[PDB]
Amino acid sequence: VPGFQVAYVVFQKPSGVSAALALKGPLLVSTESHPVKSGIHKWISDYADSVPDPEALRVEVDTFMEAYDQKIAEEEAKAKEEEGVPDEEGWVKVTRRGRRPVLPRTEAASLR
Amino acid sequence: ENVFGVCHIFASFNDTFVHVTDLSGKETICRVTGGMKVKADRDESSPYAAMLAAQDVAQRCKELGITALHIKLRATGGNRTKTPGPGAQSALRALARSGMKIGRIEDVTPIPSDST
Amino acid sequence: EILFHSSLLRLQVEELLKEVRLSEKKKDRIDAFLREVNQRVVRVPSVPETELTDQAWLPAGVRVPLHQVPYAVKGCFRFLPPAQVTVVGSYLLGTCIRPDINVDVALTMPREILQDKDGLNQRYFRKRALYLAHLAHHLAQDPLFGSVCFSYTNGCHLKPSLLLRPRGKDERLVTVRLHPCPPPDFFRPCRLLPTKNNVRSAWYRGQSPAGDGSPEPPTPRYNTWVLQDTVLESHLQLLSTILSSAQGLKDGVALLKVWLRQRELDKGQGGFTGFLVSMLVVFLVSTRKIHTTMSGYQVLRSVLQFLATTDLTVNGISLCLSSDPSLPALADFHQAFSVVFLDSSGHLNLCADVTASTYHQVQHEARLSMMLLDSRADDGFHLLLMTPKPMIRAFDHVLHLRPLSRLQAACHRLKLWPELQDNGGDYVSAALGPLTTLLEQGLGARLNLLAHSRPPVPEWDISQDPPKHKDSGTLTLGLLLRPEGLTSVLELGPEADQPEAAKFRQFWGSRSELRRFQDGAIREAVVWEAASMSQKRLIPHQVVTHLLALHADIPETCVHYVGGPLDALIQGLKETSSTGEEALVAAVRCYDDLSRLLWGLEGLPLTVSAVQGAHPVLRYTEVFPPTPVRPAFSFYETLRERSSLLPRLDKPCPAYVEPMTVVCHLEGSGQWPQDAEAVQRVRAAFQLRLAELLTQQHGLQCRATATHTDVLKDGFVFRIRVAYQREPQILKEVQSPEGMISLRDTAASLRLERDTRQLPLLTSALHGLQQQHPAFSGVARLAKRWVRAQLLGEGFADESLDLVAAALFLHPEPFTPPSSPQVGFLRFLFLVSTFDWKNNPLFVNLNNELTVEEQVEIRSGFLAARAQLPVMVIVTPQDRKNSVWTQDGPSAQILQQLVVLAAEALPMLEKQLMDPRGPGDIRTVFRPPLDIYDVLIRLSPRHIPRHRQAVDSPAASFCRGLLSQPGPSSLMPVLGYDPPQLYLTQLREAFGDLALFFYDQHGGEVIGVLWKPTSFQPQPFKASSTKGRMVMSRGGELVMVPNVEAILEDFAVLGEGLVQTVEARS
Amino acid sequence: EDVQGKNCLTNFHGMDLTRDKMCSMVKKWQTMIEAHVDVKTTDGYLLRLFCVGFTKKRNNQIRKTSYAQHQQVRQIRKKMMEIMTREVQTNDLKEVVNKLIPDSIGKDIEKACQSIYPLHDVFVRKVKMLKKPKFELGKLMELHGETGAKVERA
RNA sequence: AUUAAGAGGGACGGCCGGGGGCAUUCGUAUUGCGCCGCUAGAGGUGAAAUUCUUGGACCGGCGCAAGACGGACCAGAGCGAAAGCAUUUGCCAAGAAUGUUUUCAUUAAUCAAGAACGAACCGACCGGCGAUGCGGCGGCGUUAUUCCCAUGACCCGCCGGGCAGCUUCCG
């Protein structure tokens, strides 16, 4: 629910910005040609678009799930290539993917 | 539907007991042993004696409206044998001959776990 | 430490003793006052011998304080100065209680002015009455005494007393009661047996002087009163030898008076006075039960043990050590008196005025106190001795007898003519006994204890007629309902064959009728008409009405039963049958059906592991229970894209429907995402699947939302939430910059744990509690209604008020668990007004789960970290070291406002119920002032669905679009749509930093706006603080103030249509 | 528990597993772990539950014996006690039996113990009550869903 | 004096075991007792006979008490100097092996005497192959997963010290 608000406005050329600074008027929001919507009748309208589309929801849920999984898969595929394989200066990175169990890097384990 | 009962058939080598109670087994309907029908101690566990015992109980259940029975076959158990006696078969067979409906059969012979 | 606990106990005793005792300087001037009184009394003029009938010698301005109903007497009167003046009572004994200090003075009658036959036909009582009258005339003119008055000594209307008080300053410290007493051995003790006579029937009632007839009835109460004056000095002498020597005995005696004072068991006629326990402790010293080296606390520990275990109405005890063959037997006193005590002189019952019901109430109070003393816990001293126990606050229902003149007619129906003759003309005290005995037998199964109010001792000034028995006061009965036995609506008698059935037919009369039952027995039975449980709670009202009419000729109009008058506050506009628990049961059964449907649903990738309800309805704490609804089609719009309805612009706002939240847990698995936002995607998909399967297998209207699913079943709407076990753990993952991944609590993490884990537990825990205590639901709903009616609903959570309501039923240590909604509500106000929340946390021992060792540990931790805790802390076994239910709860300011309101609302509500006339308006404590608020906004009744829930019934209602005919519904009604709550959220969002908004969620027609003084002062230009503020040049500098005139017109624009008018003051 | 005119109204009293099914699971080349707990419900009912489980041979396993060490057995046993305890004292009698009919407790135990040692044939074999609360008529009423008849006086 | 023995002693690390001691607890069976239902017999034999029964035996149900015992899972597996050791949980002390780039530095072996405990073909004859129990090292892959509790189950190779088999070599 909006309250008191701030605004960023972009014009095509800087002279328009100067015209906005030099502008002086009452700036009526609601007029007969373009009424601006409020009141009880508005909350009915806000109840109208509050109706969700089950098809749209499923597509976005599928799309977000479709996008999520390769990133997990790509990290796993990258990790499996990087497991072992000491780099230059001969550093070997300790991972959970080896056969020797290792101490987790967690505060709870450190205190134990 | 069928009015059900529980029939207890204790089958010892010495004697045969047929006993019918309700579903909870607390109220007794009829109980006849092998000794009631044959007037001889040799034949109390004989199959013929058990058949007479089953027939008397089966007709008794008819006048009470009992039509189907659950069966609990039991041996002497304990340290002694765990085999049903000779009277078990004939009394079981005679119950089906009289027209009594047969439900589930189960062996409730007391089986010890620790030897004495 | 046990030594520290004893140290805490001993200091508590000492500080209590000092405040209830009297100072040495006050003793001295009281000794000075009595010396002046003794100097004054000894110089009185004498009068010559006159016939006792002739009373013309007394001047105008003084009246005889006896009413002298039979005016014919057979004696003569002479006045002489008192022979001996003796100060008696507890003043010289050293046991005086601070609120009332009284000094008793005995006046030894001269022998030469009394006759041998003065003990008959009230001659002694008459001569004593006029002796006081002559003294009162000669003492009133004296300027020493500020006030002089007449009263009754020892609670006897036939024994008046004289009151003297000092003038000017020191007026209230002490009062002196003047008690004339006969010579020591003037009368014969053998002439004053309970079985002997001293009032002849011919003089009392007959016109003939020597009418022959039946033997004269014994007059035990008359004999006790005459002997009572003769033994005045003997009590003081015995107590000086035994009690004065040993200290600590006085401490126990002084402590006993406070205990009797708090429970209202000492004052009134026939009350268990402190004089009695002083004789009781003397009797205990005679035995081996109490020894002289005892301390004050152990004496009260000892004395109440005797009261709780000894029933003195059947087994009397004697203080007489001597055992002579020619000594009166205890059997005779039992036939004459209900309570039988004895003195060294056997003839003195010393307990002739206390009733069996009064003694039973003492035994009941003694038993309750013993449990507290046996248990070891903190504040037991506070609960035992400083907690008042009013009769209205100690009993579930109260009953009033408005006209006491009608009780005289009750004496006529029953047979109390010998008893009315014995006690003079006091018909109130005569019929008090049998009537309570009649009722306790008729209500044996439905009651635990029956109590009756005692008439206060009157005080009237000289030159006024003494008060009559009719205007002595008002009689009130207290009922302690027994929880089991209220469920039955029948009182079962014996079978018709055996002859005790005829006895049953006598007690119940025409209402006794024959019945047969499925067990096969024919039985006499009486059936009442009680459909609802609240009506079953008023079954004793039907019982008491019928029996008094049949057995006392006391009409139903003379009985005012105060039972459940507050039930209208949690009911419909006109529906007094039930208080709503019946609707609560119907909703609960529907939830069980829905749980069974979910427990068995097929096609889910993961099956259901647990179903829990998290709504006030399911724990019986909903103030207005819901009902199944059927929306009206022509009242609405319909989308036609889903089966959901839309509110219409021209029609009024539709009826309010609130879904019930249900928490569902699925099977654990390892295929869940380990990402915070990805779990949100899976949960929303589960909402879609659950709605799809539900509508296919059972044909239910289900709407899928990203956070919940709304299901319509049997006219009810349920909100199903699916939760994941490890989601709170995932929210606690915080990778630190240094390179370590830790687990820390988060506000989002804390909130999810509350809604899915803590909330279901309390809902299940309180649901089980209602099973043991059916009255829990009524008290809790009335508690919420009062708080929300005081416009303080905001800030007080629903669960917090349930916990304090549950605290009454789990820890009513002074009292018994409540059985009526009204008695719990009174205890609710008392707890809020008197609890010290600053230094004490409230414990709610749900199904035990906490021992005393843990409790003392938690209280130790409570004081160590009081600053980090909220101002109010409630301790439960599941929610321990903190109160998550009040962390976002009410602030300290509105906390003190409620305490002031609760302390204010309690007295007149107590007075309203205790008034013999019907309460003028039960809704007085439910209306808010509407005076302190700066701006008041009125809302249209057209757009408020919750308008029938108002405290003041409007009697006119709008059409809300519902179908009266029950049945299924194919379209969804609008869920949770009410403009007053939408309007408040907009107000508190835009103008929260500037003002505070107060509203009543149940029928609120006005919103209270209170400005914040700190925000309205001028401030420098801060960009974040420019919300609703304008710039001034009054001081020549740019500063900030809220734009009041623009705010007021925002109140009208926001909420157009629903808002009617806005008024601003000051 | 109560009789209402030719209608005996009953309540749950206990649960047991049949003899033949019990004998069939107990095999020879595996280890069996058993535990028992005493738990009180929310509505005052006190229960004793017995649980039994058997180790599982893996598909690719070549070793003929599938035996669990002593500490693994105790760790398995400790988890079994905690799960049965937590699944009863939080709920009431009505909820527990609804869980017990499809044996949701046994499946939950089986999944949790896969880390220690794989298990199968996990069941709750017996349920007993040790203490019952005071009989209240209304509590029976939701489970199963009088004044008498008038006789004329002579 | 040096080294630090495929000589010995001690510490340290994580595990392991029907090893021992003290409490605690559960499970059927059997026996006895209490109450309810039913009515002439029940038991035992090769056939009987001792016994129990109308004051109700036996059988069916509910509950209580007592003394033993700890199946199936249980294996030529494990532990202990031997005799011996099997429900659960808590507590006390001890020990084997393995791991060790720790410490001391010959402190050792076998033994009459003496002490503790004690049911009721042949020979130190080098090796090999399979399994099996515990500890450790390395590994392609499956299978679960860790708030606490916990980091495993399976397969393959290898190193020790054990319980045992099938075989060879030497005197």
Ligand SMILES: Nc1ncnc2c1ncn2[C@@H]1O[C@H](COP(=O)(O)OP(=O)(O)OP(=O)(O)O)[C@@H](O)[C@H]1O
């Ligand atoms: N039932 C009774 N029988 C005999 N005497 C009585 C009875 N009740 C009161 N009295 C007498 O009343 C006199 C006045 O003292 P009372 O018993 O009223 O106590 P008190 O002085 O008010 O003491 P406290 O302050 O301790 O209550 C006493 O001397 C006592 O003997």
Ligand SMILES: [Mg+2]
């Ligand atoms: Mg007094």
Ligand SMILES: [Mg+2]
């Ligand atoms: Mg070495």
Ligand SMILES: [Mg+2]
């Ligand atoms: Mg070690």
Ligand SMILES: [Mg+2]
């Ligand atoms: Mg160990």
Ligand SMILES: [Mg+2]
């Ligand atoms: Mg061990």
Ligand SMILES: [Mg+2]
């Ligand atoms: Mg290994």
